[PDB]
Amino acid sequence: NPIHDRTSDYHKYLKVKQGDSDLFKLTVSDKRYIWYNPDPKERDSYECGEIVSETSDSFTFKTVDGQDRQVKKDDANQRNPIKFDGVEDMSELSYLNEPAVFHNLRVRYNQDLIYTYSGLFLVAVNPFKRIPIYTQEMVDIFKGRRRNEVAPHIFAISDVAYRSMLDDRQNQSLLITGESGAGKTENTKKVIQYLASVAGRNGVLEQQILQANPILEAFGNAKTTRNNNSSRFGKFIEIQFNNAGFISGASIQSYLLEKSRVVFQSETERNYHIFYQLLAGATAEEKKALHLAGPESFNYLNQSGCVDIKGVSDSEEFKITRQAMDIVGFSQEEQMSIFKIIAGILHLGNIKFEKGAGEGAVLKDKTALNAASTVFGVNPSVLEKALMEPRILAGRDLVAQHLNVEKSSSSRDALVKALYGRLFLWLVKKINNVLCQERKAYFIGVLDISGFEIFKVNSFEQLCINYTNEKLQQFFNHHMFKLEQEEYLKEKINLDSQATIDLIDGRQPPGILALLDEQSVFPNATDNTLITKLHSHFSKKNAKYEEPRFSKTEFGVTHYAGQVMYEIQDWLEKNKDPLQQDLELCFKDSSDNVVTKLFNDPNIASRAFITVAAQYKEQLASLMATLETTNPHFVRCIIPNNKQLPAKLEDKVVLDQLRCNGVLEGIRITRKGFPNRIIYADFVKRYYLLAPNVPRDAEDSQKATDAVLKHLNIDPEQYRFGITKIFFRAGQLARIEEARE
Ligand SMILES: [Mg+2]
Description:
By secondary structure, this protein is an alpha+beta fold.
């Protein structure tokens, strides 16, 4: 049992290395430390100062350089005794302050221990290197072990969920969130891997379930400045099981796909992987049939100045993507058409519009246009017309308009985005068709989506994601509450989300989205109309809203994670996501078999119509409805720094996430009552020697406990006798630790 074999990789890689002795005496020390900011020239930078003295109200400690500073006891961040360095649950800490929390994480991280619990959460720090803890052999050690039984790990939480499902006959959910680059996806893949193995039918299905996300990754992921393999869409994976506990199917729901990246990427970034895959991977012959060239030959791929990802073979990935498609069940025909769509898009991006003639646009060279038309199988003349001379309803009149180059170009861009988003939607639907069962008994759903987003520039998509996150954090809050109450009950012992939530999705009075939708009805409304309406209703009138001192195009929202300033540019457009009807018409007649679906299947071609905001709101409520029916599990992924480097855990970077994702707040909350709770025998096992009476392995554990306690003359208010554990208040246990044997 690797778990008992101190020489195993299990031990090497997932546990704090255990020496020969276990004895208390070992960790003994006179020295008492404190966590201090060597400079409020920082406030997450801290050093450990040793307390060299104290007064009845404040401590005095040395600093690193040797300077004596003074602290208020009620302001000191006491450092936990060394025995606590490396515990598996932060709930085990006596002193639960910020620096102390970060320090435990860090000690663990320094030993490549990327997983640590914090009460209800599993906290996972990206190591930025591959630790060999996800082998089948690692899978097997986790089978059926309780939380307290094995080291912290994503496999552990997944096991706890599967057992819960089976035992309570209740659906479950794993919510995996945090910043881009944090490892959400990485961990989500490990959750699927695990389940397919502890519950798979020793199979085609399973293989298809696994080969499903590589298809989605090719189409939904891209290299950004924060992750070479960034998920540009959010997802909820339902893993379906029969009553016997075997995987029976699966379903995927995608959200917020970044269609905009198709037509533009920042410097060093890449467009979606598939473009590159096709281009590299296609057969000399397929190129000719697709009018394919190098990435440099395509405006949609030649602008950022990055057409390749280090250590990534686009050609080899193509092979992998195609294989996946093969496995899921995409027909070769279907696959051609999918590639055709990718090709056509590339062609659409290469169309050059010119003016002069007048104020109107024209197409002097039509190579590009013709290229896209062939691959899509639509009429280039019809296409051309729909591009620059769409017919617009001027009341009763249906007249064609001659668009300028700009307008012309943007329209082109909107056609590309709709084709991309619809394909994505169709691929998701194709895959669900295969995997998905109408006959499911139970499910474990996996949400891999970003946590709060607070960028230099915040736009509509950030408000959306942040809106979701206010809901998820309020859901965890409710959940912590119940579970916390429950514990207390079982042992015999003793917000604000709404307001932000309402400001965003409120109907009466109307909140942001409501107002946005309203403006959305008027063809002539502008960003200015919009921001002015927002300020009118909320500036100085809604406590979670802020009108900027000078910006005219932004507004701020006080979120759970702090204020977020948003820019209103293009919100109206984004809310309607328009596409010229004539473009719809052109493509509706497409001779292509996949293309026809994207335009003729109301379920793909249309939202409902309702606005983008209204759809986001409805989809978020459905998700939450689901979640509400599960027993949830929370994974908080954390990026150690902004450089994608191993062995470089940056305090400021880390602390900031801990503050935003709910970890430190929950600790704050916890720390207030009886954060430490220990199994009677566990307690004696360790502190027997502290009392002149007590046998290490006593049968009357509680007594034994009271014993020690009494010996020590500890203050009764600081502890609580529970039915199976001894409940301790903050710092009590550390002092205890600090006791002479
Ligand atoms: Mg991801």
